[PDB]
Amino acid sequence: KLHKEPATLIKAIDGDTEKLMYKGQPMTFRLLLVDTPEFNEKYGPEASAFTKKMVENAKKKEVEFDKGQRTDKYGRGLAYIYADGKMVNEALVRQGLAKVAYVYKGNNTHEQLLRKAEAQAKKEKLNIWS
Ligand SMILES: Cc1cn([C@H]2C[C@H](OP(=O)(O)O)[C@@H](COP(=O)(O)O)O2)c(=O)[nH]c1=O
Ligand SMILES: [Ca+2]
């Protein structure tokens, strides 16, 4: 079982990265197990807008680390991010705005959950899958 930790919004970045204050440190969090298009790729601006609004509209922001690496080689936090209890990683995938991606054995607690979301988005031919 993982645990959710409080964090506070600093600023949006793009569909799968967000800047949060965590334990008094400004950190870029990269979302586990997903990949949104880069900002100037198709669906890029939409995935950016979706993550940005989902986070900044939530009263309660939380980060949840997995069991393995907590930071990548760039110093970004690797986490599942929750906004009023809804997981952003999952919501992007469900809406066809991110693919399941960067799936590593240390750090794949929510893999089945996100794959179930992805299969729904592909069935519906949403966005990336249209
Ligand atoms: C999601 C994720 C990305 N990364 C690294 C892999 C890629 O590094 P390399 O470019 O060195 O191969 C990079 C992709 O992030 P972005 O999709 O944000 O560009 O982030 C991890 O190390 N672990 C992860 O869980
Ligand atoms: Ca990306």
**Which domain does 122 fall in, by range?**
1-130
CATH code for position 26: 2.40.50.90
From the CB of 129, is ligand 1 less than 6 Å away?
A: no
- What CA–CA distance (Å, rounded) separates 9 from 56? 7
- What CA–CA distance (Å, rounded) separates 91 from 80? 11
- What CA–CA distance (Å, rounded) separates 50 from 12? 10
Q: From the CA of 72, how far away is ligand 1's center (Å)?
A: 7
- Which amino acid does the sequence have at 2? L
- What CA–CA distance (Å, rounded) separates 50 from 83? 12
Residue 127 DSSP label = G
Q: List the structure tokens of 63.
A: 């980060």
Of 19, 41, 48, 72, the one to substitute when testing ligand 1's pocket (max ligand atoms within 8 A of C-beta) is: 72
Reported structure resolution in angstroms? 1.8
What are the Cα distances from residue 77, in Å, to 36, 44, 127? Answer: 17, 21, 27
Q: From the CA of 114, how far away is ligand 2's center (Å)?
A: 16
User: How determined?
Assistant: X-ray
Beta-strand relationship, 25-31 and 77-83 = parallel
The total domain count for the chain is 1
Q: Quick one: which atom of ligand 1 is closest to the CA of 33?
A: 1
Residue whose entry in the numeric block shows the structure tokens 């992805």: 118
